[PDB]
Design a protein around this ligand. Structure first.
Ligand SMILES: NC(=O)C1=CN([C@@H]2O[C@H](COP(=O)(O)OP(=O)(O)OC[C@H]3O[C@@H](n4cnc5c(N)ncnc54)[C@H](OP(=O)(O)O)[C@@H]3O)[C@@H](O)[C@H]2O)C=CC1
Ligand SMILES: CCCCCCCCCCCCCC(=O)SCCNC(=O)CCNC(=O)[C@@H](O)C(C)(C)COP(=O)(O)O
Ligand code: SF4
Ligand code: SF4
Ligand code: SF4
Ligand code: SF4
Ligand code: SF4
Ligand SMILES: [K+]
Ligand SMILES: [Zn+2]
Lengths: 208, 360, 340, 48, 156, 291, 176, 43, 95, 114, 41
């Protein structure tokens, strides 16, 4: 497995396992799962009431010092009853390390904004309002950031189609850029590309 | 003209890239990344390629790694020529714009000779690169790099010692180090503020731990130190390019797994397994094992990350794009407190923003 | 009914509306909004243009790809008209001029050209032909425009039996020469009229209502052979109309009467250059000509088109002429003009 | 190509054309497929 | 006749003055702005063709829509186009400005700027080369050269 | 499998067979898995496919110029894991990744075969089976599989009314429905009646039944004469297949009276053959001695 | 492994203080910048004389699309739809049927040149070298639908540019 | 095999440092030239 | 070998021609219907049938990697020539 | 059934926030007609505000109407500040769109949509 | 307390931005997709 297969880092795997045990037993009030992947990245799956007590911990504890908010992310998975999955990628420049902090919400539950911890989030969760409809309470200036001003809907939700519902054109009658319902000159062709054979037996799920 | 509040309304180039990535395969999602940071094409290719190769549990050959680093440093020369020359254009010196776009034109010719398109190459692919270097390309890269030092020298002659340039950059846009980290700044926006951090040193990828270069660090967090950091990153990019030309290895340029990389056309048209693999790669695509990763590299603007979520199929389930310019343009609101309209333009210059990756 | 002209879609931009229209004179004021309303249904619109193609540029975003076909034609060329109308299932004529020129007088523009267009549309099998006359078309009229237009209306009827002839009274819009004629006479001395312009009665019609009437006549099979008279919902005098025009434009209004003795001579005073004449004696005879009331001809409401009054759209027409000191004003500023 | 001439083929154009757009020799797009649904032509004899 | 010769030479004069003094406005949107800058670069050098940047729309002739027109900047494109004096021209650069491009099926992309502005020249590429953009500008100059403004005016 | 090759030799090339107008046969692709033979012997009951030759020259075929024509002769296109037996009407037109699947019902027989109508850009490309353990287990008849292309010929696209010459002219919906309803208003009782065809859904059937009951017309008819004397259509149990299609898998004596279930309802015959083979069913027939 | 840009304390002897004051009062670096600008004045500029001189290209260059033919007249496209399956913009639309001599050939082969991203995935996915992305790039149009190529325009581009496409593929194909 | 490779002894040296070569007169010489021009103009 | 419809319009190698009553000929009014006058089905008829003495012939279309994938063609049918599925070059065994 | 609120503990505080939002839009509409120099009356804009509020007059969930108040105040923030333009305000008036067929007979005449 | 008790039905139809025509006049279909009978997988 030398030339093609990626060389596994077992030292970082063991160290992230130990630090995941560390974070899991310092904060048992909110930490639900702790997992380390094959390419040695750590996820602390927590409760959405624990946005501030976890992220202020990792930013300020002397063994964590996760000073840089790299990436704040939402993931829409509609098969769950809390469909949206909020992801915090954190960087500790002191310990040369990266951690992930994951939690959940549905359309209606407000997630606690983390601008009192990381001001870097001031736009990102704003984007999560603009794209996913996840409301963030106690946000300073929460509004849209990436879509058009009169845009109705949250685009990156998976029940929202690829093309929207309205499209624009300039209209010479009213001398104005107007929105009609969307019509395509060619339909976006859907490619059913899933092979019917199980590619990975290691990720096999148990049946019902 | 004393600025009281800046509200950057963006989304004027938001095209919904990362929802279009959800409906196309990985090879079809690769040319979206050339169009995010449209002056840093192969750096975004390299970031997405490292993300997919991290999820695939495979690695490139050595030659493809050195090609990735060589053209990533050519890409870094491209981006810092764009940064410095448009920053001097926006302050008012429109001359080294024209002086350095000839050099940038020649590096676009290097892209055209190696991939066939001058800007968006679709070249650094998951599995290495697409196509091997044409003969005599490295000799012309050497002929470029041998002479590019004098071009940096005459740019630095025009602007660095100049007092009009120091009047527009030295007390302008000062960023403290704790507010740099707490705003998610990355790259030169940290390094102008004196923070010792660079992702090619601290979290090393393909063969950057095998090259030797120095990481320029500022002292005052202003536009002038970020200018000097960009110029010295062009210097050290020429240094890495010399080390990559001297230490290029022979061998292949794709990973030799034909269930990831496409087989060669001379053996696709002869072998049956290679034709089946060519068919199923250019129609279905390779199945990525399920899971999420955050792969961040040192793009010439800073930490460029792909948070890639795969669901076992041959298409990404989710592809979040962390751009440096997003957090930098968030920090524009603090950086313009206590300056003027003729300084907010220089702060937009010193935050090297390309709005494709800011807007997706 | 061929399969390519069967109506598909939801009637949007990129649908197939089943209408193939040759709109003669589409580069003008009416043809602009007609191609606007046709191309947003997804109609094949053939635009034969005489002018520079640059003056057709605004016709290009008005429909989907391959829904507008621009082509040259000459007014005295039946070959170009046969080259244009041979594929259409409707031909709408809009060729007109407020003034007569060296090459084309009113007999060429109104009598010869629409008769040639209707003759070629007849012998090429076009189903629907729509002609746009004027409401005051009279053989005994005092103006050459209305006489030649009534003669051309008669000839269009007698060479096309199913011709839908439409009578607008006075069309106003953003690019009209009815409210913009009234609003661009302010620095000339005080808007001269005959008997202060209170002996002539008008009812202007809005161009979107005219366009909706033309297109609902395209889609009505019961409009074949009919003759329509598109008039507004309210009848004004001319004096209180000009009052209301200068009152929406927030302009000083100092009128004075101007009789026959020299107000037909300001025609030959104001076409002395070969440009567009700012006013002409035919326009003088037509501004001071009252709109006739024809109850027997159907109108907008007989096609299901609601006639929009002037008090809703005069602000939209006349905001262009306010200087700066009353640009940002309201529609609730002007007391409306009295009807008759 | 006075030193290395291109390989002669029966189908390569003898006469090179420039950009014909703007002229009546320009490209016009059209579908290259035939009719999909063949309509029923009713019988031309009367039904009596 | 004589007057046909007069208006023909005046048309050639004004078409020469308008094709050899095109002033494009500084208007980029996306990746194609980089290659438009390379069409201004010293290799290709727009400025030798009389083609020089003017920042305001009032003082410019041709609007090169270079990049992706989204739904949020469609009225900004239209008001920039409207605030150009006549004659104004539009060159469409790149696939997204032509027909929606690589982001064609997106919720927030105006599928071509020909939905918004009247487009004269379509320059194809992703991005088109700066040589191809300079080709599109020279074809726009050829389109201005064969305009017949005063000939049609003397014949109308 | 692996990702590359070692076979540096010359491959075999097998002569292509002619087994019908439905099955395009490219026998170089045949991996000799014998699903042809097992399907034709055990389900289709044909016993006319086989393996001639021996070794690497062994060929699946018929050995003669014989045309494989059963009522299930297209299902060998389904089970062939390679492209040796392709669908000749479907052939070269489409490609399965760009096809849209629509799970529909057959109407060609009264078995009710679950099918996939797989289309592409608003045009019906082909008809695949669906699995249903109680109807058509994963098979369909050849009529079901290959009658999709009569659905794009002879079609009625526009309304037609008789003109003054008594010929059908194309008309609108307003004119056609007005000229129907004018005659509809002048009827009552037995003045108006209705014949239902063979392919009409229950929605349109109760639509026309309610429309003729608004005229108070009890006369609505079908083309198929079911006898009404006795219980008639009142009790459902004397016009259904009362046991099930799957009930053949529990039966041990099947008496077939006055029918040819091979062609009237072919997958019911396939279920009778499967019970004949596996449960040792004893089948008798009253009728003409058909195969 | 790191260096400090702008961490030089200026010397404070009378020599260097007088040098900096003469730099302030007599503008040394401004004359240095004017000297560098004057040094670029006297150079041969890098402006090629387009359209008479053309910028340098490689045989890998990705321009206008073209369908090739075999050296027998038979076109190479055998309707396998890999090029529209790999096409990241879905610019390619293919519909086929068996033609009169039973060959698997296309009836519709459309490439929308206003969706196309010119990335050459179709020429590297095509298993018979049928679609290639040729060397022409000066194919600008005055009309939008002239960049909606059907099969006939792509075959005419192939028959137009085959004498160059064959030589580019001949010089390049060993790298593929 | 034939491949784009660097030569045998490697490529030559590639300069990458700051090279601003300190041209011009000193301060005192420039003040002397200027004051001499002043004195000649005054005389 | 392009043939022309009775309406005056050329016919493509597919067979596509607009009917006489179809309005969509108006896109060619004043312009041209671009067809390619080198039909592939007529240029492959002009190729000679290659006589070989083998039982199975291999075809790659000429050029090696510049042609199509190499496929193997059986020539047992003395009636019918073995046409290659990619290039259309048809082969015959001379016995 | 125990969920976490947003601002409103029940329907009464939610209707209070809807009522304050209606007050704010009713104050905003004359300035919206003025500074955008729209071609409609003030009463027509107030009718459109009434229609857009009566569109959502059926919800008995406090979190949903809290989010509707939040989205309405975002619309109001984009209206008071000139962030929307004449086009984004006049998108509420579906003017260029033809009136869709509402009865069964004309929908049957023109298309397949029920 | 920091929680409420919503007794009503979870319904977000006013929040998704979907027009009414693509809410009520559509018919969602919830199904395990049938096996492609070309393939035993
Ligand atoms: N107030 C009004 O506008 C009213 C108008 N009408 C009638 O409605 C029609 C449309 O009116 P409107 O658009 O406002 O008028 P315009 O003068 O603005 O438009 C006339 C159109 O016809 C073309 N045209 C004019 N003269 C000739 C000619 N001699 N040969 C060929 N083409 C020619 C023009 O193109 P080009 O640039 O080439 O000249 C233009 O496209 C006319 O027939 C007019 O008489 C009736 C009642 C009221
Ligand atoms: C120019 C035009 C600008 C357009 C402005 C658009 C803004 C639209 C904002 C939409 C926000 C809402 O709809 S909030 C309404 C939700 N409320 C509910 O569902 C509870 C029911 N509410 C009502 O019935 C309301 O009438 C009242 C007044 C709160 C209570 O009345 P009850 O008595 O019956
Ligand atoms: S057409 Fe393509 S390469 Fe060009 S600006 Fe658009 S996204 Fe960028
Ligand atoms: S089913 Fe296919 S592979 Fe199997 S024996 Fe028949 S033809 Fe050969
Ligand atoms: S698709 Fe299957 S049967 Fe067809 S050639 Fe390939 S491996 Fe053989
Ligand atoms: S170059 Fe790319 S975008 Fe263009 S047709 Fe080929 S695969 Fe599609
Ligand atoms: S062009 Fe090539 S890849 Fe595309 S369908 Fe034709 S043969 Fe296949
Ligand atoms: K098969
Ligand atoms: Zn061959």
């Amino acid at each position: 497995t030398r030339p093609t297969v990626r060389p596994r880092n077992d030292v970082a795997h063991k160290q992230l396992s130990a630090f995941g045990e560390y974070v899991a037993e310092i904060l048992p009030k909110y930490v639900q799962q702790v997992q380390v992947s094959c390419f040695s990245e750590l996820e602390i799956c927590i409760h959405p009431d624990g946005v501030i007590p976890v992220l202020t911990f990792l930013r300020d504890h002397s063994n964590a010092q996760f000073k840089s908010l790299a990436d704040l992310t939402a993931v829409d998975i509609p098969t769950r009853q809390n469909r949206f999955e909020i992801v915090y990628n954190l960087l500790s420049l002191r310990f040369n390390s990266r951690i992930r902090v994951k939690t959940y919400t549905d359309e209606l539950t407000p997630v606690e904004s983390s601008v009192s911890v990381y001001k870097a989030a001031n736009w990102y969760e704003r984007e999560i309002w603009d794209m996913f409809g996840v409301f963030f309470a106690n946000h300073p200036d929460l509004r849209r950031i990436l879509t058009d001003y009169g845009f109705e809907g949250h685009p990156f939700r998976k029940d929202f189609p690829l093309s929207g519902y309205v499209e624009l054109r300039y209209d010479d009658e009213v001398k104005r850029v107007v929105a009609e319902p969307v019509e395509l000159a060619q339909e976006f062709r859907k490619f059913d590309l899933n092979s019917p054979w199980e590619a990975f037996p290691a990720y096999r799920q148990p049946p019902e | 003209e004393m600025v009281r509040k800046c509200d950057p309304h963006i989304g004027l180039l938001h095209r919904g890239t990362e929802k279009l990535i959800e409906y196309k395969t990985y090879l079809q999602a690769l040319p979206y990344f050339d169009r995010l940071d449209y002056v840093s094409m192969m750096c975004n290719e390299q970031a997405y390629s490292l993300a997919v190769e991290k999820l695939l549990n495979i690695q490139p050959p050595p030659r493809a790694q050195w090609i990735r680093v060589l053209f990533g440093e050519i890409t870094r020369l491209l981006n810092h020529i764009m940064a410095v020359t448009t920053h001097a254009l926006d302050i008012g010196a429109m001359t080294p714009f024209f002086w350095m776009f000839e050099e940038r034109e020649k590096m676009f010719e290097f892209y055209e000779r190696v991939s066939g398109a001058r800007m968006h190459a679709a070249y650094v692919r998951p599995g290495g690169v697409h196509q091997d270097l044409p003969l005599g390309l490295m000799d012309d890269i050497y002929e470029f790099s041998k002479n590019f030092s004098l071009r940096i020298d005459e740019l630095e002659e025009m602007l660095t010692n100049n007092r009009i340039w120091r009047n527009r950059t030295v007390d302008i846009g000062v960023v403290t180090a704790e507010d740099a980290l707490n705003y998610g700044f990355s790259g030169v926006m940290l390094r102008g503020s004196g923070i010792q951090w660079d992702l090619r040193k601290t979290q090393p990828y393909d063969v950057y731990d095998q090259v030797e270069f120095d990481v320029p660090i500022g002292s005052r967090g202003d536009c002038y130190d970020r200018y000097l950091c960009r110029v010295e990153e062009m210097r050290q990019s020429i240094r890495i390019i010399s080390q990559c030309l001297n230490k290029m290895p022979p061998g292949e340029i794709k990973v030799d797994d034909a269930k990831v990389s496409p087989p060669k056309r001379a053996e696709m048209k002869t072998s049956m397994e290679s034709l089946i693999h060519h068919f199923k790669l250019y129609t279905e695509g390779y199945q990525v094992p399920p899971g999420a990763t955050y792969t961040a590299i040192e793009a010439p603007k800073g930490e460029f990350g792909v948070y890639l979520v795969s669901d076992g199929s041959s298409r990404p389930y989710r592809c979040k794009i962390k751009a440096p310019g997003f957090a930098h343009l968030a920090g524009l609101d603090k950086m313009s407190k206590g300056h003027m309209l003729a300084d907010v333009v220089a702060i937009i210059g010193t935050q090297d923003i390309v709005f494709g990756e800011v807007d997706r | 009914l061929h399969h390519a002209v069967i109506p598909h879609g939801k009637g949007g931009r990129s649908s197939v509306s089943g209408i193939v229209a040759t709109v003669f004179g589409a580069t003008g004021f009416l043809g602009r909004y007609l191609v606007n309303h046709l191309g947003r249904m997804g109609s094949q619109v053939i635009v034969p243009y005489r002018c520079e193609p640059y003056d057709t540029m605004h016709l290009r975003p008005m429909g989907d790809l391959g829904q507008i076909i621009f082509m040259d034609w000459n007014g005295r060329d039946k070959d170009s008209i046969r080259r244009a109308v041979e594929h259409s299932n409707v031909v709408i004529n809009l060729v007109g001029r407020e003034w007569e020129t060296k090459n084309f007088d009113f007999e060429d523009v109104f009598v010869k050209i629409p008769q040639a267009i209707a003759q070629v549309s007849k012998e090429a099998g076009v189903e629907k032909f729509i002609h746009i006359s004027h409401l005051n078309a009279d053989i005994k009229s005092s103006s050459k425009y209305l006489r030649n237009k009534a003669v051309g209306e008669k000839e269009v009827r007698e060479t096309f039996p199913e011709a839908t002839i439409i009578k607008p009274a006075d069309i106003f819009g953003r690019e009209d020469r009815f409210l913009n004629y009234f609003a661009n006479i302010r620095w000339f001395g005080g808007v001269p009229l005959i008997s202060l312009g209170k002996k002539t009665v008008k009812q202007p019609v809005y161009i979107v209502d005219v366009t909706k009437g033309i297109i609902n006549a395209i889609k009505d099979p019961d409009a074949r052979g009919k003759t329509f008279a598109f008039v507004g919902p309210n009848r004004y005098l001319l004096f209180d109309l000009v009052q209301y025009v200068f009152a929406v434009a927030h302009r000083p209004f100092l009128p004075y009467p101007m009789p026959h003795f020299a107000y037909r001579w300001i025609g030959r005073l104001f076409e002395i250059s070969p440009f567009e004449p700012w006013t002409t004696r035919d326009k003088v005879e037509r501004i001071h000509t009252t709109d006739r009331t024809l109850p027997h001809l159907p109108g907008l409401e007989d096609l299901g088109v609601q006639a929009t009054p002037l008090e809703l759209k005069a602000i939209e027409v006349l905001r262009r002429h306010r200087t700066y000191r009353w640009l940002s004003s309201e529609i609730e500023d002007v007391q409306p003009a009295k009807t008759v | 190509p006075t030193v290395k001439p291109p390989t002669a083929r029966k189908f390569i154009w003898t006469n090179h054309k420039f950009n014909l757009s703007g002229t009546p020799q320009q490209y016009v797009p059209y579908s290259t497929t035939r009719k999909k649904i063949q309509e029923w032509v009713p019988p031309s004899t009367p039904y009596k | 006749s004589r007057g046909e010769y007069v208006v023909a030479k005046l048309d050639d004069l004004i078409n020469w003055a308008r094709r050899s003094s095109l002033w494009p406005m500084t208007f980029g949107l996306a990746c194609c702005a980089v290659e438009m800058m390379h069409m201004a670069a010293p290799r290709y050098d727009m400025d030798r063709f009389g083609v020089v940047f003017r920042a305001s729309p009032r003082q410019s002739d041709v609007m090169i829509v270079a990049g992706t027109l989204t739904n949020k900047m469609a009225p900004a494109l239209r008001k920039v186009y409207d605030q150009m004096p006549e004659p104004r021209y539009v060159v469409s650069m790149g696939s997204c400005a032509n027909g929606g491009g690589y982001y064609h099926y997106s919720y927030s992309v105006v599928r071509g700027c020909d939905r918004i502005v009247p487009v004269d020249i379509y320059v194809p590429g992703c991005p088109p080369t700066a040589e191809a953009l300079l080709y599109g500008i020279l074809q726009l100059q050829k389109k201005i050269k064969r305009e017949k403004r005063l000939r049609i005016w003397y014949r109308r | 499998g692996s990702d590359r090759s070692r076979f540096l030799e010359g491959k075999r090339a097998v002569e292509d067979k002619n087994i019908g107008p439905l099955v395009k046969t490219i026998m170089t692709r045949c991996i000799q898995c014998t699903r042809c033979i097992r399907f034709a012997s055990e389900i289709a009951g044909v016993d006319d496919l086989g393996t001639t030759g021996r070794g690497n020259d062994m060929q699946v075929g018929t050995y003669i110029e014989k045309m494989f024509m059963s009522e299930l002769s297209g299902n060998i296109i389904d089970i062939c894991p390679v492209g040796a037996l392709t669908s000749k009407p479907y052939a070269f037109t489409a490609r399965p990744w760009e096809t849209r699947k629509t799970e529909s019902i057959d109407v060609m027989d009264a078995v009710g075969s679950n099918i996939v109508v797989s289309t592409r850009t608003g045009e019906v490309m082909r008809i695949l089976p669906r699995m249903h353990e109680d109807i058509n287990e994963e098979w369909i008849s050849d009529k079901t599989r290959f009658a999709y292309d009569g659905l794009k010929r002879q079609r009625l696209t526009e309304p037609m009314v008789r003109n003054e010459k008594g010929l059908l002219t194309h008309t609108t919906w307003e004119d056609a429905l007005s000229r129907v309803a004018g005659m509809l208003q002048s009827c009552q009782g037995n003045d108006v009646a209705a014949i239902a065809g063979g392919l009409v859904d229950a929605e349109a059937l109760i639509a026309l039944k309610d429309l003729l009951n608004r005229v108070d017309s009890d006369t609505l008819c079908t083309e198929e004469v079911f006898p009404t004397a006795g219980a008639g259509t009142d009790l459902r149990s004397n016009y259904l297949l009362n046991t099930t299609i799957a009930g053949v898998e529990e039966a041990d004596v099947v008496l077939l009276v006055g029918t040819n279930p091979r062609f009237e309802a072919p997958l019911f015959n396939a279920r009778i053959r499967k019970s004949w083979l596996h449960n040792d069913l004893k089948v008798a027939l009253i009728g003409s001695p058909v195969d | 492994t790191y260096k400090y840009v702008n961490l030089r304390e200026p010397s404070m002897d009378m020599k260097s203080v007088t040098d900096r004051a003469a730099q302030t009062l007599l503008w040394t670096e401004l004359i240095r910048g004017l000297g560098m600008t004057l040094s670029y004045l006297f150079r041969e500029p890098a402006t090629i004389n387009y359209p008479f001189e053309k910028g340098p290209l490689s045989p890998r260059f990705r321009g206008e699309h073209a369908l090739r033919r075999y050296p027998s007249g038979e076109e190479r496209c055998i309707a396998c739809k890999l090029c529209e399956a790999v096409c990241p913009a879905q610019a390619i639309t293919i519909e086929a049927e068996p033609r009169a001599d039973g060959s698997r050939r296309t009836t519709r082969y459309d490439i929308d040149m206003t969706k196309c991203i010119y990335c050459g995935f179709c020429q590297e996915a095509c298993p018979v070298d049928a679609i290639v992305e040729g060397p022409n790039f000066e194919f600008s149009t005055e009309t939008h639908e002239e960049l909606l190529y059907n099969k006939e325009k792509l075959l005419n581009n192939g028959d137009k540019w085959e004498a160059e496409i064959a030589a580019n593929i001949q010089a390049d194909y060993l790298y593929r | 095999v034939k491949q784009d490779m660097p030569p045998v002894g490697g490529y030559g040296p590639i300069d990458y440092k700051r090279n601003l070569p300190r041209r011009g007169l000193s301060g005192y010489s420039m003040f002397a030239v200027g004051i001499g021009a002043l004195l000649f103009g005054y005389w | 070998g392009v043939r022309t419809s009775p309406t005056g319009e050329k016919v493509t190698h597919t067979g596509q021609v607009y009917d006489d009553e179809d309005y969509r000929r108006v896109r060619f009014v004043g312009r041209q219907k671009e067809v390619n006058e080198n039909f592939a089905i007529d240029l492959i008829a002009e190729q000679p049938v290659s006589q070989v003495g083998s039982r199975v012939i291999s075809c790659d279309g000429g050029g090696g990697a510049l042609g199509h994938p190499r496929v193997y063609i059986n020539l047992d049918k003395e009636t019918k020539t073995g046409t290659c599925g990619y290039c259309g070059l048809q082969f015959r065994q001379q016995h | 059934t125990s969920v976490k609120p947003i601002f409103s503990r029940d329907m009464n505080e939610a209707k209070r926030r809807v009522r304050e939002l209606y007050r704010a839009w009713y104050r905003e509409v004359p300035n919206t007609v003025h500074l955008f120099q729209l071609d409609i009356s003030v009463k027509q804009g107030r009718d459109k505000v009434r229609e857009m509020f009566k569109k959502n007059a059926h919800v008995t969930d406090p979190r949903v109407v809290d989010l509707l108040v939040i989205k309405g105040k975002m619309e109001l923030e984009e209206t008071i500040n000139v962030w929307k333009q004449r086009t984004h305000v006049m998108r509420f008036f579906h003017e260029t769109e033809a009136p869709r067929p509402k009865d069964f007979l004309s929908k049957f005449y023109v298309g397949h949509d029920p | 307390t920091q929680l409420i008790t919503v007794d009503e039905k979870l319904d977000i139809t006013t929040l998704t931005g979907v027009p009414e025509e693509h809410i009520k006049t559509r018919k969602a279909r919830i199904f395990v997709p049938a096996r492609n009978n070309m393939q035993s997988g």
